[PDB]
Design an enzyme around this catalytic site. Structure first.
Site, PDB file in Angstrom:
ATOM      1  N   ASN B  79       0.749  -1.094  -0.155  1.00 35.48           N
ATOM      2  CA  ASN B  79       0.146  -0.038   0.510  1.00 35.48           C
ATOM      3  C   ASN B  79       0.763   1.249  -0.003  1.00 35.48           C
ATOM      4  O   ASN B  79       0.267   2.600   0.200  1.00 35.48           O
ATOM      5  CB  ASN B  79      -0.601  -0.339   1.198  1.00 35.48           C
ATOM      6  CG  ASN B  79      -1.897  -0.971   0.919  1.00 35.48           C
ATOM      7  OD1 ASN B  79      -1.790  -2.871   0.843  1.00 35.48           O
ATOM      8  ND2 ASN B  79      -2.778  -0.987   1.265  1.00 35.48           N
ATOM      9  N   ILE B  86       1.047   7.155   0.541  1.00 35.39           N
ATOM     10  CA  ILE B  86       0.526   6.097   1.247  1.00 35.39           C
ATOM     11  C   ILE B  86      -1.644   5.776   0.753  1.00 35.39           C
ATOM     12  O   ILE B  86      -2.108   6.813   0.417  1.00 35.39           O
ATOM     13  CB  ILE B  86       0.726   6.566   2.608  1.00 35.39           C
ATOM     14  CG1 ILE B  86       1.925   6.501   2.896  1.00 35.39           C
ATOM     15  CG2 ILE B  86      -0.145   5.724   3.940  1.00 35.39           C
ATOM     16  CD1 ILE B  86       2.099   7.594   4.275  1.00 35.39           C
ATOM     17  N   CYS B  87      -1.288   4.089   0.916  1.00 35.92           N
ATOM     18  CA  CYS B  87      -3.144   4.488   0.271  1.00 35.92           C
ATOM     19  C   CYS B  87      -3.412   3.961   1.555  1.00 35.92           C
ATOM     20  O   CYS B  87      -3.312   2.417   2.068  1.00 35.92           O
ATOM     21  CB  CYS B  87      -3.127   2.748  -0.576  1.00 35.92           C
ATOM     22  SG  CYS B  87      -4.711   2.495  -1.079  1.00 35.92           S
ATOM     23  N   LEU B  88      -4.287   4.790   2.175  1.00 34.82           N
ATOM     24  CA  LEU B  88      -4.618   4.588   3.315  1.00 34.82           C
ATOM     25  C   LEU B  88      -6.223   5.290   3.634  1.00 34.82           C
ATOM     26  O   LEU B  88      -6.533   6.871   3.614  1.00 34.82           O
ATOM     27  CB  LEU B  88      -3.731   5.456   4.964  1.00 34.82           C
ATOM     28  CG  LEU B  88      -4.366   4.787   5.869  1.00 34.82           C
ATOM     29  CD1 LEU B  88      -4.187   3.404   6.263  1.00 34.82           C
ATOM     30  CD2 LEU B  88      -3.135   4.935   6.895  1.00 34.82           C
ATOM     31  N   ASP B 119      -6.287  -3.303  -1.695  1.00 36.22           N
ATOM     32  CA  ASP B 119      -6.078  -2.576  -2.236  1.00 36.22           C
ATOM     33  C   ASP B 119      -5.205  -2.391  -2.728  1.00 36.22           C
ATOM     34  O   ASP B 119      -4.558  -0.914  -0.761  1.00 36.22           O
ATOM     35  CB  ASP B 119      -7.460  -1.428  -1.437  1.00 36.22           C
ATOM     36  CG  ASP B 119      -8.022  -0.210  -1.794  1.00 36.22           C
ATOM     37  OD1 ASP B 119      -8.131   0.460  -3.013  1.00 36.22           O
ATOM     38  OD2 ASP B 119      -6.865   0.592  -0.706  1.00 36.22           O
TER      39      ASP B 119
END
Ligand code: ZN
Ligand code: ZN
Lengths: 55, 149
Positions: B79, B86-88, B119
């Site tokens: 992620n 960042i994928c959060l 994701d």
């Protein structure tokens, strides 16, 4: 003593949000919340505010 | 001045008296809207002993809008972008004024401990993460060794 407003961290929590039921904000920050007003904790719509006769 | 600025300063004080576990943050010079954070690699992860740096940009309308957080240190994670992006969820659509940088850092640590491959921000690393967990752990350790420490 108690926890501060989750939004500004400087005032005492002074009201309750309905219908989620969270006590997390002061009056002013509540007014500061952008419309449509959502609970800062669960983001559900605030349909009614009931003041806490605290602080 | 603004509500965002007072928020950032009270938040800075709370961080200087109750710092998050394994995490720290603060202003890069005189600007209050530009911070730097440090996350030391979690023990429940191939990121151990590594020290990871992040940059933090607060919006003009900050508590009502999410902070732009990005990694400075290179890292092997499903992620996390090569741009340190960042994928959060809580940094995008699950954001809320309640959340704080303390809670965000803690959440990022949790993201290093337990990634979300469903994701992915790096498709290939996610695929390796859910086909060859050994290869993932291994490479993560190596990248932890050539960039972090
Ligand atoms: Zn407040
Ligand atoms: Zn709520």
């Amino acid at each position: 003593l108690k926890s501060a407003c989750v939004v500004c961290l400087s005032s005492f929590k002074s009201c309750v949000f309905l219908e989620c039921g969270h006590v997390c904000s002061c009056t002013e920050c509540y007014r500061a919340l952008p419309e449509p007003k959502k609970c800062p904790i669960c983001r559900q719509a605030i349909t009614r505010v009931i003041p806490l006769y605290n602080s | 001045g603004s509500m965002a600025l007072k928020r950032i300063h009270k938040e800075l004080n709370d961080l200087a008296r109750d710092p998050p576990a394994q995490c720290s943050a603060g202003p890069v010079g005189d600007d209050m809207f530009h911070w730097q954070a440090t996350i030391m690699g979690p023990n429940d992860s191939p990121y151990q002993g590594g020290v990871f740096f992040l940059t933090i940009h607060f919006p003009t309308d900050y508590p009502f809008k999410p902070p732009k957080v990005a990694f400075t240190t290179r890292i092997y994670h499903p992620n996390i972008n090569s741009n340190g992006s960042i994928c959060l969820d809580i940094l995008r659509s699950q954001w809320s004024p309640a959340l704080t940088i303390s809670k965000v850092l803690l959440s990022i640590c949790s993201l290093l401990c337990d990634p979300n491959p469903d994701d992915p921000l790096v498709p290939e690393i996610a695929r390796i993460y859910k086909t060859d967990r050994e290869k993932y752990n291994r490479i993560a350790r190596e990248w932890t060794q050539k960039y972090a420490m």
